[PDB]
Assembly symmetry: C3
Homo-oligomer: 149 residues x 3
């Protein structure tokens, strides 16, 4: 502990240029959610599990949400990370303390139904969505059958 | 502060249509495993670390297992998630309470020796496995050398 | 609970061949870091968050570090995992106890400025970096604006 304790104090106080390092404490790390796949989307009949972390400064900062169930989507990556305006920090992002967990989950449900070509987290899936939509839908349906449904 | 408790009550009793939100309590979250790379597989020289999480209603739901070590394989992704029948619920999947941690780890070891081309979690890797096999095997050997600890 | 303890006993005493289990005892898991995007790189004006885990055997094994903020780079994957010599053990790697958390964070910052096409975790990005650099720089800039920029 002597090294680590002192090491951490040196990083807190005299870090290298462009670098900072601190401790956080989440309010809650064991919250989970489930979203049903929507009618008239390739995720229909699938059930999708998610992780919801409530960070230290909620509701001033947004919940931190990743998909646990795999999903084939241009805005959702191999690690389940999600690109969405209401999940991004103010002032540039759309999160505010006048929204809540329910509204962000409803926004993720909407995203599943309305993928956004301008916000790629998965460049290959985004390219397929743009230039060969029938192939994208086939793949999205198969992944839903394999990993969700 | 008190908001969150109230918020969760409201999510629990009256959620949005198609959405549910609840609290999980894992039986154990710090359990680890290690699988030695198999003979006559491209993973031979490596050792592979995994995390094993035991959920609240085990053994009625399967263990939640992810590779911590990077591995180049069509059925395993960058988060270490694993597409395998014994890790999925019936009727589609093969989990039942007559299986256990030891048997599912053995099943994952067999999956490492026998990849499945129809169960993809990484699109480029699956395609390459089926259509450009020599490139797959070269990449799998190189990833073992560069990103796994050597045996 | 009784079932789980019985299983852990059996795994400790008579595991399947090639497979072992144990419980990790990390020194620390709640440490966070931040790297400012470097001047004269495509990551300029981005702010990048990272997770730092300090394992049981630090400083004789390296710290375990990944990006939480998405970044477009040949040596960093979709889960934020980082391919870098000082994060790996010898003989293949360069971690030694004379290094520390601060120097490794500085090495990650240097890696951002100087990608390494020998060690690709992202094959498509590595090819773009080698053969179509203006397109690499343009895409790295766009990803920075979309996922890492705060004003
Ligand atoms: Zn984003
Ligand atoms: Zn690709
Ligand atoms: Zn699957
Ligand atoms: Zn590596």
């Amino acid at each position: 502990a002597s090294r680590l304790k002192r090491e951490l104090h040196m990083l807190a106080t005299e870090p290298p240029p462009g670098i900072t390092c601190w401790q956080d404490k989440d309010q809650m790390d064991d919250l989970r959610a489930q979203i049903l796949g929507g009618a008239n989307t390739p995720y229909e009949k699938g059930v999708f599990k998610l992780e919801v972390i409530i960070p230290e400064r909620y509701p001033f900062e947004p919940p931190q949400i990743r998909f646990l169930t795999p999903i084939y989507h241009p805005n959702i990556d191999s690690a389940g990370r999600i690109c969405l305006d209401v999940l991004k920090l103010p002032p540039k992002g759309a999160w505010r303390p006048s929204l809540n967990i329910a509204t962000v989950l409803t926004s993720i449900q909407l995203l599943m139904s309305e993928p956004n070509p301008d916000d790629p987290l998965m460049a290959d899936i985004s390219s397929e969505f743009k230039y060969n939509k029938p192939a994208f839908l086939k793949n999205a349906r198969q992944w839903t059958e394999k990993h969700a449904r």
